[PDB]
Amino acid sequence: QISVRGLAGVENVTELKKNFNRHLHFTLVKDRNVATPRDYYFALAHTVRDHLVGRWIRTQQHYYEKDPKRIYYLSLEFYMGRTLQNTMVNLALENACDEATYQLGLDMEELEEIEEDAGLGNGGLGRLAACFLDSMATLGLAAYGYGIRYEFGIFNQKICGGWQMEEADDWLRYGNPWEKARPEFTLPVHFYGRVEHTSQGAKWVDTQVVLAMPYDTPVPGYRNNVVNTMRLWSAKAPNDGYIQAVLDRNLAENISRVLYPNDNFFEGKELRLKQEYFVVAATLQDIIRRFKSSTNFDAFPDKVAIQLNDTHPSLAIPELMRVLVDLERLDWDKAWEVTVKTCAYTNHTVLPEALERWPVHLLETLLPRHLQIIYEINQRFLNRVAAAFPGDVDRLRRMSLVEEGAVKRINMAHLCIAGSHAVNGVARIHSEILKKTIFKDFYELEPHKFQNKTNGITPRRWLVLCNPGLAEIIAERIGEEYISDLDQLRKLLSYVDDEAFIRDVAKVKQENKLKFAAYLEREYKVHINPNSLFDVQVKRIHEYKRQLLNCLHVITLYNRIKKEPNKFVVPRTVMIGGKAAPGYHMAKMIIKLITAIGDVVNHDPVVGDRLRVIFLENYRVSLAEKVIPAADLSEQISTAGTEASGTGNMKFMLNGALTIGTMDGANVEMAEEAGEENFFIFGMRVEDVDRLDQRGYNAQEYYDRIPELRQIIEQLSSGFFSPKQPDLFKDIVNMLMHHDRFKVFADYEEYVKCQERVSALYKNPREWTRMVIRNIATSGKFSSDRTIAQYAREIWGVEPSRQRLPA
Amino acid sequence: QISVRGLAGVENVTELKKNFNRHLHFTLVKDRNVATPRDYYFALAHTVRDHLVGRWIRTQQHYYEKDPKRIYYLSLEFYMGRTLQNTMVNLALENACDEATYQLGLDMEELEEIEEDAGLGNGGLGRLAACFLDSMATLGLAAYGYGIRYEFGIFNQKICGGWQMEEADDWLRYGNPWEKARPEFTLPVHFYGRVEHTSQGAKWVDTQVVLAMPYDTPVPGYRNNVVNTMRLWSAKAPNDGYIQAVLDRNLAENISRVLYPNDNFFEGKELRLKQEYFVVAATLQDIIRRFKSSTNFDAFPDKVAIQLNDTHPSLAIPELMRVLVDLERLDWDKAWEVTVKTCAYTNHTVLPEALERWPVHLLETLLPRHLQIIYEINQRFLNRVAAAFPGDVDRLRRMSLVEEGAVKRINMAHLCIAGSHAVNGVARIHSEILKKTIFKDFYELEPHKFQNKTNGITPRRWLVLCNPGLAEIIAERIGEEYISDLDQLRKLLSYVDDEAFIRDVAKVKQENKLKFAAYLEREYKVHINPNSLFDVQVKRIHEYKRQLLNCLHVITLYNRIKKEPNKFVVPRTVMIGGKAAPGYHMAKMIIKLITAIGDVVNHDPVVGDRLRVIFLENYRVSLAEKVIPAADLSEQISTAGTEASGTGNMKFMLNGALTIGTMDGANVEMAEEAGEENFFIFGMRVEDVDRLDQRGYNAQEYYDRIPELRQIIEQLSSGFFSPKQPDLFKDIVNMLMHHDRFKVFADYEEYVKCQERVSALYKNPREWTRMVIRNIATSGKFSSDRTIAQYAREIWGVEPSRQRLPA
Ligand SMILES: O=c1[nH]c(=O)n([C@@H]2O[C@H](CO)[C@@H](O)[C@H](O)[C@H]2O)cc1I
Numbered sequence A, B: 001q002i003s004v005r006g007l008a009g010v011e012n013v014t015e016l017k018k019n020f021n022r023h024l025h026f027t028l029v030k031d032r033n034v035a036t037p038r039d040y041y042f043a044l045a046h047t048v049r050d051h052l053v054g055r056w057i058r059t060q061q062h063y064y065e066k067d068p069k070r071i072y073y074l075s076l077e078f079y080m081g082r083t084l085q086n087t088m089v090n091l092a093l094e095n096a097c098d099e100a101t102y103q104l105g106l107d108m109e110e111l112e113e114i115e116e117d118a119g120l121g122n123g124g125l126g127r128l129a130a131c132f133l134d135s136m137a138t139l140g141l142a143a144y145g146y147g148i149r150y151e152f153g154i155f156n157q158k159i160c161g162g163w164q165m166e167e168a169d170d171w172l173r174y175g176n177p178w179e180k181a182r183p184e185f186t187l188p189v190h191f192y193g194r195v196e197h198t199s200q201g202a203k204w205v206d207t208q209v210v211l212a213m214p215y216d217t218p219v220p221g222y223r224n225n226v227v228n229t230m231r232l233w234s235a236k237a238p239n240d241g242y243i244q245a246v247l248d249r250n251l252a253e254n255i256s257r258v259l260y261p262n263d264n265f266f267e268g269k270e271l272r273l274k275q276e277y278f279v280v281a282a283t284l285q286d287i288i289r290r291f292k293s294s295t296n297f298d299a300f301p302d303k304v305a306i307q308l309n310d311t312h313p314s315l316a317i318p319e320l321m322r323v324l325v326d327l328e329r330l331d332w333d334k335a336w337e338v339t340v341k342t343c344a345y346t347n348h349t350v351l352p353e354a355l356e357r358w359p360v361h362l363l364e365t366l367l368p369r370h371l372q373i374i375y376e377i378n379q380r381f382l383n384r385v386a387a388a389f390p391g392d393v394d395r396l397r398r399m400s401l402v403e404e405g406a407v408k409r410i411n412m413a414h415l416c417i418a419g420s421h422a423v424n425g426v427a428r429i430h431s432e433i434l435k436k437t438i439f440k441d442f443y444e445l446e447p448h449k450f451q452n453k454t455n456g457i458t459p460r461r462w463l464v465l466c467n468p469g470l471a472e473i474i475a476e477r478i479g480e481e482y483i484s485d486l487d488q489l490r491k492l493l494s495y496v497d498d499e500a501f502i503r504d505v506a507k508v509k510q511e512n513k514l515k516f517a518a519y520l521e522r523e524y525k526v527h528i529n530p531n532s533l534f535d536v537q538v539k540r541i542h543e544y545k546r547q548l549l550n551c552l553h554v555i556t557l558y559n560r561i562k563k564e565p566n567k568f569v570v571p572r573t574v575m576i577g578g579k580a581a582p583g584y585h586m587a588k589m590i591i592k593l594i595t596a597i598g599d600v601v602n603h604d605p606v607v608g609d610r611l612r613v614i615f616l617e618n619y620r621v622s623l624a625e626k627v628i629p630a631a632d633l634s635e636q637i638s639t640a641g642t643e644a645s646g647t648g649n650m651k652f653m654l655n656g657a658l659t660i661g662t663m664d665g666a667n668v669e670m671a672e673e674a675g676e677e678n679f680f681i682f683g684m685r686v687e688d689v690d691r692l693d694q695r696g697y698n699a700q701e702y703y704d705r706i707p708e709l710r711q712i713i714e715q716l717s718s719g720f721f722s723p724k725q726p727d728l729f730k731d732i733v734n735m736l737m738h739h740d741r742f743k744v745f746a747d748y749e750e751y752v753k754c755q756e757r758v759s760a761l762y763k764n765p766r767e768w769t770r771m772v773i774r775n776i777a778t779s780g781k782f783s784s785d786r787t788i789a790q791y792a793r794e795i796w797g798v799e800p801s802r803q804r805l806p807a
């Protein structure tokens, strides 16, 4: 059907249908009359998986022989989503399988909807890890993603009376065709015990052993026949009254059972620290095992790179020291040199609540040797600081890896900076903030460590796969090369004045809206006007992301409608979606507020179809793949200084939505790339937030001077939005009025005005689309291929290569 | 190589090697240079499994269309062992795959040793269930085995300082290629709750739901292309602070986690009753579901047979009533008629400690409705009894399903008799015992219910598969038809005087001994003389099986050697093996005694290689497949009246061992079949045991009159066998002297004498072998094909058929 989807050979289609029938019969043990769509999905899934394996074995072989430097990406999260379409896309099978399946009388798109998301992550950070893997394979790096195989991923979100209910994401119920259990590479991981000192140095003894079993999942590059590996560890009990002993094996295996659902918030729970140590211990043995199969650790940093995705795998650092010092018997100083040259650290936040600080009484019980190593790292480090800023006792206490107070804590970020040769933020403004604020002392010590690597997304999933219509019309004009070289999108700038491209860009958008509006009605009782501006805010629910600000705009538009009912307004469907962590009380209330607003707004007959407020249930990767291509307006409205980068913001830019946003995170570079005239920027910059903090933020001031805002608070306070529980939202009004860390009211005026400007442009279809073209045409920078090539040259010291391997 | 192993086609061998390489590459994702023997096993396993599936789908199709009556075999145990060789045997692939694999430069026999036993059972009863399935498929019945998929089977037995250590049988670690998960047929099973009464009868409410997911494993008949199904249920939690809630799912899934290791001993534990209800609830829904896919339950008994393997699935009875009365709204009396016509019960014991008697306070909490139904069944039943024996208040209390006492109990055997149309023992003497003793009252009520179905074993596993040498020489003489018609073995009787057959039967035995003697040395440090008589007792360790009697013989032979050292004795390797249930203290001591005897006997230089005592570690199915073909003497020495049937006894008869045994269980019919001159029978009959019980058994009497016995007890008492712990065995001497329920000393004289006669015959090789021929030639009766054909005609009302289905 469409060109970017590859060829449908007469030989390829014929082969595909014969393997499909083979899998149905032999692998699934079904026949044509008993088979359900789920059996058909599986038959196709095994049939595509067959095309990978050849390439997988051949890639792993190549690396064994070329012996290049290896990249290890350690993360507690890999937010993968569905695998099948992505695999087809990367292998050029999409049109073949579509043909092959249609010939069998099946609809492939209907089959695709059956795959569970691999929801092994929470949001931004987990999904970055997934995009990065796609980019690393596409750039032919010998890269390995390591993590944990959680049996349960992020919970599925149900709304019930407008409240979130969590249920377990049992994603493996029907099996996962993509993974390959590798029980032969099972490795022990130790916990508790105690530390003994001999003539021959420290020994870690009387430990509990947990086994770590790996599962390998293939990671195909984009049409280069490179297939890299993602290795995820599962917890198993070792084999050594009786009934109870067998049942107790579960305790050990609980380690990999469930993903912690707290995003951008640290919870200091033991089970979590076990998970962190677990993935780090098994991964280093596996790394070292591979290194020995080429005694001499001098070349270890020329053969190994370890990238820490935030501080979650920070135990890599004392653990590599432990292995090098206690087991391999290198002297401390040489070990340290090796460690620092091997490791690098990416920070993804400056929010105090999000930083990991582990109580010492935890580490002592669980990992008594690592604590020792950490103390030693601390002592030697502080000696460097003292030597460089003599007499500065205050710097010494600020820089210490150990924090004093009611409970002593280890600050893990300090550990990562000390033990890594590079530290990087994830957008330019966020890297500057780190250097000016929380890591200012560290930067003064070793300015050479600090870097920036602005985030990107993969154009495979985020354009070719979720938006074939747009990818197609881009392809008509400029060819296909841009899929692995997104900078080529600039070429589209000479088409901004082209009446036919204009008409086509608008049409692709109108189709995605028509489809999404249907998907809304088919899977939920809704009814939305598809001529309206689609105003969407999708991301995890957090105070700093300021969903509440969006709510105040929505309430304002509604109050203005009710005030002058027969005045023309640009109609809108406001969609807000995302999950709250189960313990985040405020977050759960915001979801309730949102639906409570939909109950009033969506039933007011006076409002018509001019305003619809929808909360989108179960925001997840595969839901992002649908709503983003349908979006007109992207809401990126965090308080300046709090969104480290953002990446949804890039997904929307790439898919033809315009952005209303603050000068935060990667928004700053997006607007710089498209030009600020092509972006709706409002509100405080970082500097303004600081001026406000110095004076002190008093929200009453905005409530006294802005009558439209006063009215909303009064509606909230008095029960207008919860008629049966007048006081439902006293928590929200309370927080907004007395302890808003995020200054919602301070940006409200300027947000509303900026929203009026969006509405005005939307009234002129042609000029809206031309601005769209100017955004899409400048999104090249935000390709994760660009990002990874920067990591590769500036941190890992490997050369990317876009060269095909043979099939 | 050998004829019974099928053809090696030029096309079949070529096809097999291409699918082997396909599985290695596509399924296992290995290549020729990284593959281990374990990968090779798997490639072959998937390759043989491919030949089943065609036949499996086709068999299930046939049954859907012919709509025959269905047999459901409910068991808490299916002791399956390895699947691969059995599958090859039944499909006639053995020689092909052997050729195919040799051509690939592999040794198939070495590959076979890699498969885990499916040890989903304890011993006799579990293994009967496995033999029965093979027989049901071979006889073309539309039969289904239902059970539980335990994640851990019978523990692996290690000896450590001569004590048993248990470790977990983690049989699924590497995956099970034979099973097919069927998550689409998941069914709810309810627990706890309470009972409500409406206008419309009882309702069972506020229950906890556990999901039952099935796994199907193919059961191939012997060369008839019938492939039946064994369906095993796994426990899953339903999908509906948060961390802890996810981890707690494990509680629900614990139901199918582990097999109870108590054999011939009832433990009244909750977890066990949950398991019993679990398999029964899921199985009936599945049965009824299938019945509805043909409102009218009158024909239910013409379409369904349910066979209860002991009382373990006795809840089938009130559960079918529950479904029929509460859910389908049949009146009580019609339901009952249907139930009784559907169900039949096989008893496998008369040991009081082995009978299930469930505390009422358990059933009430767990299954409050079933208790009600059981009370109602009891009331109506006792009204029949009262009506038939009026005034006999003692019979009423003896026959009650409810036992009074400190705790009220439900006697489940009474439930099964009341609610079944047939009750059967498992050997002729055991069926007579039931009618004369424990079920005498029941029999007087309904003599027509009581039957006998003498156990059998399958000649596929127990001859063709574990003993190809002997199967081959039998085949030379009489053809192959006897493999599915074991009665044809009589024909071998005209070869008893044939010098060449004699020489061949002896040679097959000598080879199996040479192999087993090697297997001993290769896998353990041993050294055994392969010219010696191989004296083997393998079975679970129990007081009633009288391993202790064997020990007293062994000790006696040794004392006599030490008394006259330069006298000739027939040399012997005594091998004793079997597992003890983890809580059975006495049983664990016997194992210790046995090894303690090996430590003295096997190092006495005066003894030479004339006497060796070996304890065979980890007795299990696949170990039985090796030691039985190597055996000369089979020890079947339970006290008359306690071994319900025995089945090892038949395995040995079939494989050319002679039997020393008491007149117990199926020994009585084996000797009747071979003639008593061809059998070494010693000791009390049942009648003698009763005479003894009436007088009273006083063991001192034997200790005072038999000096050889007195000496052994003194050696045991004084520390001769435990020199560092003089008192190690005071428990044993104590029990033997004051509370031996099994009368070891009473049979000792007569056992020793009978053992001298065995030794005498062994001195004349030719006459030993002729007697061997007379045993093997009369084992036909003990084929489980004979047994199942009897169940089929006399209980289930279906006609067996040996007719091929087409391929
Ligand atoms: O716990 C976390 N969860 C996240 O989603 N991020 C996100 O990390 C993304 C990846 O860099 C950033 O775009 C984003 O701004 C940041 O919030 C960081 C932490 I630390």
Ligand SMILES: O=c1[nH]c(=O)n([C@@H]2O[C@H](CO)[C@@H](O)[C@H](O)[C@H]2O)cc1I
Residues within 6 Å of the ligand: B122, B123, B124, B125, B126, B128, B262, B263, B264, B265, B310, B348, B349, B354, B426, B455, B643, B644, B645, B646, B647, B665
């Ligand atoms: O818990 C049990 N375990 C067993 O192995 N059997 C056995 O059941 C076998 C199968 O009928 C008999 O041969 C044997 O005599 C009997 O002991 C019975 C019970 I009840």
